């Protein structure tokens with residue numbers, strides 16, 4: 201018949217399953233740590249704090265200190281926070297990865313955390329089985345969970361629109377420094393650049409500051425431009441990139457093409473190719489490159505973004521070979537990849 | 553002013569945060585793998601299967617094979633499944649931890665997975681912040697999310713009651729073999745045993761089979777006994793353990809005391825102490841012992857269960873010192889711990 205176990209089963213193997221089952225506890229404990237603002241209370245204090253001292257500084261009163269102690273115990277085991285005995289008291293501090301929970305610098309990841317761990321925005325992941333056994337539905341998991349496609353949903357839910365746009369703002373803050381410094385030569389000779397699907401303008405505001413002689417434009421759907429601050433020297437245009445892309449010396453698209461299937465990407469890439477000059481025009485794509493042959497620090501979260509696209513947008517994350525095919529099919533002459541030690545890489549696509 | 557970064561920031565540190573943010577993706581991809589029954593289709597086939605072969609055996613038709621490929625790619629990166637080139641084709645197999653997703657043996661963990669990753673049963677974790685900043689509410693996160701306390705909720709939601717009771721059934725299946733074999737001496741001389749809060753009877757059915765001369769009783773709330781199969785030689789009694797515990801030579805409580813605060817536990821433990829004989833009576837507690845000094849395979853999920861109790865039941869997981877105090881305060885003479893290489897340990901509590 202079947203396998204019969206006769207000696208002790210491996211505890212580590214079973215623990216690996218329990219840790220996968222409860223993966224959501226890491227996401228949702230982290231969310232609570234962010235909502236309580238623990239890392240910033242400690243960082244501002246400048247030294248480890250007792251349970252009582254932390255409690256006195258929390259966002260509201262009163263505080264259940266038993267609950268706080270037990271969440272902190274979990275956070276210490278995550279190696280995000282520390283706990284030690286100092287001068288006769290137990291005090292809580294920050295471990296090195298907690299720096300990404302500290303406000304005031306480009307790699308603070310708080311906006312992204314609050315977007316991704318939002319209850320409504322997690323709901324699509326419960327429809328993953330229905331993405332494979334689709335019973336002949338063509339809708340995304342986002343539509344099954346929340347009623348309509350992501351972008352129309354954002355147009356009808358202003359607070360959700362804002363939360364998502366700030367997550368994207370954050371995502372872009374993580375890479376701008378590397379972009380404008382390491383990839384400064386990409387901006388040479390450009391007099392105009394349009395950020396297609398540029399969101400609430402983080403990328404253009406940073407490019408415009410680093411390169412004062414380039415006239416920058418942000419272009420997105422009306423409900424996103426409506427959630428943006430006013431601009432002085434930067435053009436803000438609203439519209440639909442499938443029907444119109446503002447012409448310029450260069451087009452940039454960050455986290456756009458991974459929202460769309462290959463047919464749609466080719467339509468967008470053709471529209472971009474015809475928006476830039478034959479003479480040194482270029483299209484700057486910023487998106488993940490999936491390595492399916494070797495492992496990198498961001499490999500796990502890049503595969504996670506592949507399914508995030510599958511459920512939320514209808515898109516995908518692509519390997520270099522897939523990018524090559526898409527860029528070829530849109531009729532470009534060639535492409536060049538630049539790594540910037542980020543989740544995304546830069547792919548410059550060059551027309552004839 | 554503030555810290556200024558001047559050299560490249562650590563990619564691994566940032567990846568650790570992204571992996572915590574997306575912890576829920578591991579839980580919910582695993583859920584989808586269980587709903588698709590991938591591990592059992594492969595295990596029954598007895599060799600790795602192509603994407604097409606897997607598709608032909610899935611729970612329903614048609615199948616989106618792109619989606620299936622991409623979920624499998626994530627599952628292979630989890631090291632739950634494998635992918636290889638064999639005789640000119642890409643075939644998917646099982647890695648060693650996938651044995652816990654295979655049906656037909658005591659360590660199949662499928663019931664637990666489907667309980668813990670259920671959408672409604674995950675909802676309380678979104679109210680973790682409100683468990684610390686409770687705005688002077690005394691309700692559990694379960695009540696905030698789902699309307700009332702867990703046990704009354706189960707009484708009013710028969711499908712949820714069943715799903716939870718089968719999760720508990722599974723949890724008990726994981727330990728019964730070690731219990732009845734390693735701890736056989738605990739059952740010596742006992743003529744009657746009552747499993748207080750014994751659920752749908754897994755523990756008693758297994759004890760009754762291993763020890764045919766012990767008259768076993770399962771005792772739980774009416775809506776749980778109502779979700780149980782009929783019994784011949786095993787007594788099934790319904791009631792409230794805070795008002796009555798059926799008298800017997802021994803009482804067992806598995807995953808009971810971790811549902812309750814210390815005052816409640818002492819009330820239950822006193823009721824048990826007075827239900828067993830002064831002459832060799834004993835109370836057999838099966839629950840986690842938290843080690844807060846060193847690390848073990850199950851440490852992470854035990855701390856996770858501490859917050860699971862905090863949110864869902866109002867209880868907690870306890871260290872040995874906390875167990876000692878509780879057992880002392882209920883007026884017992886002593887206790888003995890037996891490890892059984894499981895999530896829970898056995899704590900025998902002995903009256904005078």
Ligand SMILES: Nc1ncnc2c1ncn2[C@@H]1O[C@H](CSCC[C@H](N)C(=O)O)[C@@H](O)[C@H]1O
Nearest residue numbers: 368372397398399420421424440441454455
């Ligand atoms: N048809 C369309 N035309 C223009 N923008 C669109 C669009 N469909 C979606 N978008 C926009 O594409 C963006 C995808 S999210 C990426 C936002 C930003 N580039 C960043 O990386 O931070 C959203 O802001 C969305 O509103």
Ligand SMILES: Nc1ncnc2c1ncn2[C@@H]1O[C@H](CSCC[C@H](N)C(=O)O)[C@@H](O)[C@H]1O
Nearest residue numbers: 720724749750751772773776792793806807
């Ligand atoms: N007042 C009460 N009296 C009796 N049983 C109770 C109770 N309150 C809760 N319970 C039961 O305690 C159990 C906790 S879950 C543990 C179930 C089982 N002992 C196992 O380990 O698999 C549930 O079955 C629940 O219905």
Ligand SMILES: Oc1ccc(C[C@@H]2NCCc3cc(O)c(O)cc32)cc1O
Nearest residue numbers: 311312315316367368371455459508512
């Ligand atoms: O920094 C982030 C990284 C990834 C996300 C995931 C997000 N899921 C919903 C749909 C969507 C769409 C996107 O184009 C995108 O770049 C990210 C996401 C949010 C973020 O705020």
Ligand SMILES: Oc1ccc(C[C@@H]2NCCc3cc(O)c(O)cc32)cc1O
Nearest residue numbers: 663664667668719720723807811860864
């Ligand atoms: O095997 C399992 C392990 C842990 C759980 C968590 C569960 N959360 C809801 C409330 C609750 C209550 C319990 O008494 C318990 O032992 C487990 C749980 C479910 C399971 O099916």
Ligand SMILES: [K+]
Nearest residue numbers: 322323674675
């Ligand atoms: K959820």
Ligand SMILES: [K+]
Nearest residue numbers: 357358359360
């Ligand atoms: K809204």
Ligand SMILES: [K+]
Nearest residue numbers: 490491496499
């Ligand atoms: K990669």
Ligand SMILES: [K+]
Nearest residue numbers: 709710711712
């Ligand atoms: K129900």
Ligand SMILES: [K+]
Nearest residue numbers: 842843848851
């Ligand atoms: K432990």
